[model samples]
Target: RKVYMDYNATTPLEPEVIQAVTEAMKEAWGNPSSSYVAGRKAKDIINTARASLAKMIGGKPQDIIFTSGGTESNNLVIHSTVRCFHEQQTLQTRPHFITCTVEHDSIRLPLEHLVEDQVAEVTFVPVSKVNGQVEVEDILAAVRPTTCLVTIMLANNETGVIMPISEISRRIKALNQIRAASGLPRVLVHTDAAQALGKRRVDVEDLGVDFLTIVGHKFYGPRIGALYVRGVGKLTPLYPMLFGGGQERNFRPGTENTPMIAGLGKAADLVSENCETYEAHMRDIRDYLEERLEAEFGKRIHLNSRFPGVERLPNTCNFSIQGSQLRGYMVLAQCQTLLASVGASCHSDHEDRPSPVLLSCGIPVDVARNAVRLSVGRSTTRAEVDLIVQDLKQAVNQLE
Candidate 1:
C-alpha cells in the first residue's frame, strides 16, 4: 500500500472543504461586486468564509486578504512594505529589512532579489546552531535606524522548529516605543505562518505581528491563501499590490475566487473547532513513528529537528540516517510506495548538496545530506505509520 508522509509539502483537501467548494461553485457563481440578488448571495458566501477565517485567527473580516497561495500572500507583504519604504524614504537611504537565514524561499528569494536590484538592504540573522531556532536577541540586534520591516517565518518548513515570533513582537513593540520617541521609523513585523497553522493555535492578537501569512493548502484547504493585517484599517499603511476592481480594499484585486475562498473558510472552521483533537492525533502518530524509527535504526538515526525552549511542530520528524551513508534522496528514490522528501518538496530532488536550512543550523554536510522529513497529518493512521516505517527500513537496507 502507498503511504504519504509529506504533509508539510502540501495537504490534501478535506472532504468537508471539497464539499463546500463544490457547493459554492454550483450555487454561488455570481460576481460579488454586482448589485443584484445573485451577487448579494455570492458576496454573502465570501463574507461568511471571511468571517470564519478571521475568527480562526482572532482577526476581523476586513483583515483577511485572499490570494492564490502562500507565495502571493508573502509577496504581497514584501512588495507593499518595500513600496511604502521607497515612497516614504529618501533615495540615498535604502530600506533595511531584518530576517533570518532559515526562512522559506517565498520570503528569502524576494528579499534577496530586492537586495540584488539595489533597492533594499537586508540583514539575515542566524539561528541557533543547536536548536535550529532564530534567536530573539540576534533579531533585536539587527534592528537599525533605516530598518523598516522585519519579516520572519513563524516556523521552519523543513525542520519544523517554531520561531519566537511573539517574543520578538513584544520586544519590537518596546523597541518601537523607543524608536517613536527618538523619531526613528517604526520597524514593522511580518511572519510567514504557513507551517504553524492548524498544528497549533494561531491568534493574531497573541502573535502581535503587523502582518501574518496564511496558506489554505497548508491546512487542508485549496491552493489559496490570505494575509492577516492587524487592525487593517487604523494600523500600518498597506500599498496595493494589484490594480483592478477594488477587492480586498484594493490591496489585491481581481474577481474573488469564490469556490476556493469558501473551501478555505470551511478549512478554517474545522481547524478552529477541532485543533486540539487534530494536534493530539498528529503528535501521537508522530511520536509513534519516531519511536518506531528508533527501534529500527537504534543509534544510527540522528534527529535533526529540535527546539530547546520552544516546541517543534508535533507532526514533523526530520532526521538523518547514520552509519550506512545512505543519502536521503536515494532512499526515497528506491521506495515504490512510500512518498517523502529529503527537504522542502521544491528542492528535494537536487542531490547536489545538503539542505540550506539544515546547513544554516550548523548541521554537518554529511549528516544533512542524509536527512529526510516525514510530516504526519491529522488523518494519518497508525497502520499507515507502521507501513511507512517498514518501507523506510527496507529502502535503507537496500541502499546500505
Candidate 2:
C-alpha cells in the first residue's frame, strides 16, 4: 500500500524518457559545437529536443534556452531582466520589480537579494484573503515609472491557484502604450510555469507573457529546465547572464547535456500528445480522493486550496484536518504507507509552523498548522487513492 501523492515536489521519469536518455547517451556522446559527424548527431538531438519543448508551450524552437533546473531558470530571468534595465539607464530611478507574496523561493530569494543589494526596488503584492490570487488591479497599481518587470507564477506551487496572467498581460499592454508615448520604460512580464505543464494548458501566446520558466522534472522528465523568450528577435534588451561560446543564441552558453535534453524532449512530447487525457484522469482521481477524505473527516476537514470560482491545478488537493490540535507533519509522519507533503518539499523538514503560502491566503495560524498538500500524477490510480484515504483515517484516529 505504499502510495505517492507528491507530484508537486517532483515526478518520476517515464519509460520513454528513460529510453530516450539511454539512446542519446549511447549514440550521441560528442561535443555539440564540433563540426564532425558525431557532433552533428549531438546537435541534431538537442535541436529536436528544443523543438519539442518549444512546441509544448506554443513557442518556437529558437525561443527556448536550456538551463540546469527551475532555480537556475528563475534566477536567470530575474537577473537578466533587472540587469537589462540597469544597462539601459533610461529609468531615472532604480529598476523596480513586482511579484506576489506567495511565489516559490526560487523567484522570491533572487528578487529579495536584488533589494538587499540596493540595486533594485521590489513590491510584494498581497493576495485575496478568500483565495490565494493576486488581483490584476493590485498588480497594475503597483507599477511606477521605474517598474521594469512584473514576475508572477502561472500556477502557485503551494495552493495550486492559477493567477490571471493573460488578463494582467492585456492591462499591462494598455499601460505600456501610454508609457511608450510618455517616454517611459516598458514593463516586462514573466511567469514560472514550473507546476503547470501537465496540469493545465500552457500556451505562451495565450498567456501573453514575455518570459516563462519551464521545469523538466515537473513533468516526468530529467532535472533540467528551459526559458522561453517571447520574441527572440525583439528581445535585445534581455542580456545573457553567462559568458560563453554563444550557445543558445548567446542567451544561455554551455555545452548542452544531450542525454538529459533528449529525455526532457520525450517528456514534452508525451505531455503534448496526451495532456487532455492526463488532465481529465488526474482531475477525476483528485476529486475522488477529496470526496473520500471529506467522507471520513467530515466537519473536521478544511479545504484550503479551492476558491469559489477560481481555477486551480487539476491534480492538486490541498487541505487541512482540524480537531485535536493536530499538526500536518505529525499526520504525515504517522502514515507509513503514504507519501504526501506537509508543504513544499524544500521547506518541509525545517519547520513545523504554518506555511507562508497558506498564511498569505489569510489562513489563520492554527488552521495552516494542519494543512497537507496531496498532488496526484498520471500514474496514480483510484485504488491508490483508497489506500491513501484508509491510511490517513487510521493515522488521524490514532493522532486524535
Candidate 3:
C-alpha cells in the first residue's frame, strides 16, 4: 500500500464521518429552507453542526456561516467585508490590505484579485526565519488609517510554522484603539486557520480576530468549510458573488450540502475529542523523522524553520536536500510510495519558480527549488516512517 504523507494537502475521510454522511444522505436529505418537517430536520442538523464548529473555535453558533470550502470562506470574508465598508461610505479610494508572505494561496489569490481589480491596496509582509513566525511588529507597521483588513494564515502549509496570531490580534486591537482617537476606520483581522484547526487549539475569542476560516477535509470529512464572523450581524448586507436560493445567511446562496455538513460535524467532534492524543502522536512521529534525517544526512539536509522555542503543527517538516543535484519532485518520483510535495501542490507544476514562502524568508532560489514537504497524520505508522527514511536515503544517494 502507498504510504500517504501529504496530509496537509488533504486527509482521508474518517469512518465515523463517512457513517454520519451516509445516515444524513438516507434520512436528512431535504432542503433546509423548505417549510416542512423534513426541512426542519435538515435545518436542525445544520444548526447543530454550526454550534459544534463554533465550540471548536470558541465562538457561538450564530457567528458561523458554512461555505463549500476554504476558498469560498476566504472569498466571502474579503469580498463581503470590503463591500460593507464601501456601502457605509467609509472606504476612500482603494482600501488597503495587509497579509504575510507565508499564507496559503487561498488568501494570497484573493488579495491579488482585489489588487488587480483596483478594489484594494496590498501589503505583503516578509516572514522571519529566525523566529519561525511573522513579526507582529511588521504587520502593525503595515497597517494604515485606510486599511480595510488584515489576512494571515495561522500556520504555514509547507513548514508547519505557526504564526503569532494572538499577539497580532492584540496589536491590531491596540491599533484600532489608536485609530479611534483619530476617527479612522477600524481594521478587521481574519485568519485562514485551515492548517491549524485540528492540530492546534484555535480559540477565535482569545485570538481577537474579526473573521476566521476553516475547512473540513483537512481534519477528516468532506470538502466543506466555513467562516466565523464575530460582530457582523448579517451576511446579506454584503453583495454576494453568486445568487441562488439565498442560503447561508445570503452571503453564500446555494443548496446546503446536508451530507457534507454532517460529515464535517462528525469530523469536528472526533478531532475535538481526540485532539490531545492526536497532537502527541504527530509530535512524536515528527521528532523521530527529524532525528533520523539529521543522523543520516547531517548538514547535507537543511530544515527550513528550526527557530528556537517556536511552536508549530506537530506533523509537518519542510526541508531541502543540500549538496544534491536532484529536485524535490525528482526525489519524490523515485519514492512514489511515500507521498510528498515539493511545495504547495498547486504550484508544484511550475518548477522553475521558487517557493514564495521560502523566498519571503530570504532563502536563495536554488535551495528553495529543492525544498521537500512531508506532513504526517494520526494514521501514520512508525514502521512506515522508518521505511520512508530508508528509501529516502537511497533516493538521495542515487541522485547524488
Q: Identify the superior model by lDDT, candidate 1 or candidate 3.
A: 1
Over 2-76, each residue of candidate 1 has an lDDT whose tens digit, in order, gives 888999999999999999999888888889978877677789889999999998888898888888899999988
lDDT of 2 by residue, 257-281 (tens): 9999999899999989999988999
Superposed model 2: Cα runs more than 4 Å off = 90-92
Number of clashing pairs per prediction, in order: 0, 0, 0
Best by TM-score: 2
- The residue-by-residue lDDT of candidate 3 on 347-384, one tens digit each, is 86785566877777766667777888889998887888
Lowest-sum lDDT 10-residue window in model 1: 84-93
Point out where model 1 deviates above 4 Å. Answer: 90-92, 349-352
Ranking by lDDT: 2, 1, 3
TM-score of each: 0.97, 0.97, 0.95
Write down the lDDT of every candidate, Cα atoms only: 0.88, 0.89, 0.83
Ranked candidates, highest TM-score first: 2, 1, 3
Q: Candidate 3: misplaced stretches above 4 Å?
A: 35-37, 90-92, 129-132, 234-239
